[model samples]
Target: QVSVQPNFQQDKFLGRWFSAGLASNSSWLREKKAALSMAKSVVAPATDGGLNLTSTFLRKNQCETRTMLLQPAGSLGSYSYRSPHWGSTYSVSVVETDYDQYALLYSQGSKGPGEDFRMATLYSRTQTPRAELKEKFTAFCKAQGFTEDTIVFLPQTDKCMT
Candidate 1:
């Protein structure tokens, strides 16, 4: 199981972060790994005492964005992401972070009946991430049972930014 920090400060955690790398073994992501690029997200305080996350990335050369509300998962440091389109809810948590430079986010849940998966996303304060970010992510993913092919450092691009 992944460990998380206690009493996660929502204020300090809210900010702009680049989705620099991804670690997953999901078949869907596995197929599209090579085509995936880095994404951008803005984290803000939500009205319901949760958190707001806005993710932006490119889809077939066009900008695609989606806003998500992460609700508290009946505990501190753990959040729940309810995907409307997929009708699925994911258990999310900030496994590690400095609230300044980098963070590692973990999420796992069911896509549907009998479909379960886990993924970790690396969030960097800047688009230019340090080498250790990828290294740590790989190690983390490895510990989670992900193989070498399952970990990927996404390429950077600004075509989706506006």
Candidate 2:
């Protein structure tokens, strides 16, 4: 339950954040508009003072990939799920956050580069996140020993509906 912000706020936590970019799962993210709507749809209230993120991504023609995360639930409880990807369940242990705009995540697995650590995305309330947010996020990831070059920003199709 490591978050970048010292105190997490529901109002800030619940706003829409486009998948502007990410460290992995590039092929899985939806287009810009889809990202916005998807964020709005799945962000719900959580009793644990953390956010509950449950969203599905329609990867063009592939089966939709879903990710669900909850904090204060810890690694075993707060994780992501896809319908039929990589055995349907992989655990993501989030270690830190860059405010509500970005964070680092790791999956508990014993194979490939997917191994035990990687990056996931969170966003501020806009499709086009401010430069400060991205820079801070990038720095955080770098501090955690992640390869920033390998990271790809999921480009919004200039379709921010806010």
Candidate 3:
């Protein structure tokens, strides 16, 4: 339910962002023992007045990509996106960010009845985020009721660049 900053510039946010870490309760993601090596996202403006996001990641030594449209909900940084593959709607909000360096994003939704889900991610311009920034993200996630075990730090990989 957190709102984004006033006057959040979607244009200034267009670019590539690397995932520093993720906190979620999804069992499928938790079962993956190996950290995602190439978790990167290319964000651009969508023709529908939303955000076109192309996310690529390396999982189990295999490359995978998924593109989704994030439509603005009501506020500048509030968005809603439904995954065609998963058949679920995700409501996301930019909880905190500088729009150039780092962003703390929170997402919540339900796949079905009694299937509530919550996720948080820390995104950075660089693969190697600052220590302070990482700490801040950890605290933020904890404040949102996520435990340490539910969080996973993603390692950087060169596969995306190649």
Candidate 4:
């Protein structure tokens, strides 16, 4: 298992986070984030010390949302997330973060025989991350075995913020 932060502060992480960039092994997912829609995710603390994630996006000109309950795994910054709406369970890890500025999350899961999936997402408090921060995020993804060419920068349109 990948090592995560020693102590993740749910309070510091609770709020809205915009997807600045996303890297995945799936082509369909790469195209999805590059579509003419924006993605906004909100993270809140759950009563059981886990986290509730609500992700909203636009599809076919309609707003769609998915909610998931992420329970803490054996380590800090590691979570076992199951989304009934999506019918998938993922091992979520907060790979890197400053809480106030940006966060890098890594998720891995298996579907079936030889069908493993991995995704890395860069989330920022602001829709537009600074140039230096973007570089940092890119480097982080690279370290996680994602090539620069695989990174898809998501649009930060105001339409999704509302």
Candidate 5:
């Protein structure tokens, strides 16, 4: 089970957040940061609070949007997601979040038995956050056994202003 923040303020987390950084152990991530771009997301307390995130992306040839639901598991900050489209299961936990500036999260997604990936993500209320949060993201990923090569701070862009 993944650890989560204690007494997480569910209501304060409702708003838009930008994906400022990402770190993962997938082979694709080993060289994918060069191709990855910034993404925007929105969160709402749609029940006891299932994360309603709208991320714009391209599938095949056109831009499409998808929403991932993280249903509350046990408590407020812990969550579980069974991939409905992909062959995966994800355990997501809020490592920390101030609900105003930035949020640090740890998630593990497993695609079968031997194929599993750990993702460490940093989300900022704005496109760019201060130096301290980025440093904290690095430190958190390192503590999770990620190497420098796998960690990356996503570039800022307005390509998908929609």
Candidate 6:
């Protein structure tokens, strides 16, 4: 018999995070931080344990992420994710996870050469967790081989809290 537990409890992952902080170890991150900041200003509340986020890319800002399913963590959980960004349909694939002071998320895709790979991120449940929380999470990321400078603090404006 296989047992399952939600990736993150519905209650725990619910509510709007407002993108208070965004951490990226790639150049694409710095290139997109400005747009992400603006997007967070218009952040909307999540319903049914899912959040719909719109991130701008280049000239036209092409993207839409909605209807994220919470996979129960356990022997039964499989690999897959549903994102409107890929297409009208849902994309399925395996992604691992870890959490301490920061959340570690890894995901890969079916794409071109060297494109299909897992990306890791050190993220927090909130923009600023607390002095101690921030310190630990920061240290955790650093210990994992990412430079402290790579972490960017993107604060959500008042619009996000509302």
Candidate 4 Cα deviation (angstroms), residue 48: 4.5
TM-score of 2: 0.55
Please list the C-alpha lDDT of all candidates, in the order they appear: 0.81, 0.48, 0.81, 0.79, 0.80, 0.39
Residue pairs with backbone atoms closer than 3 Å in model 5 (clashes): none
Candidate rank order under TM-score: 1, 3, 5, 4, 2, 6
**Judged by lDDT against the true structure, how good is candidate 3?**
0.81
TM-scores, all candidates, are 0.90, 0.55, 0.89, 0.87, 0.87, 0.48
Please provide, for model 6 over 1-162, each residue's C-alpha lDDT reduced to its tens digit, 9 standing for 90 to 100. Answer: 212234643334333333333344567566754555422222223454333333322224333443455332233223334444553222222222222223333334434432443333334445455566555545544654556666555453443233
Candidate 5: misplaced stretches above 4 Å? 31-33, 47-49, 57-62, 110-115
Global Cα lDDT for candidate 6: 0.39
Error of 5 at 118 (Å): 0.5
Per-residue lDDT for 3 in model 1? Answer: 77
In TM-score terms, which candidate is top?
Answer: 1
Give lDDT: candidate 6, residue 133: 50
Regions more than 4 Å wrong, model 4: 29-36, 85-87, 110-115
The candidate 5 region of ten consecutive residues with least summed lDDT is 56-65
* Tens-place lDDT digits, model 1, residues 24-112: 76686756755887778999989887899999998786888989898887666788887887678788888888889888889998456
Query: Per-residue lDDT for 1-162 in model 2, tens only?
Result: 334334534454454445555554334333433432323225666675555665444345433545454444343225443323454344555444553555444444334444554455545455567777777667765665657554555545432232
Q: Candidate 4: deviation at residue 30, Å? A: 6.3
Off by over 4 Å in 3: 26-29, 110-115
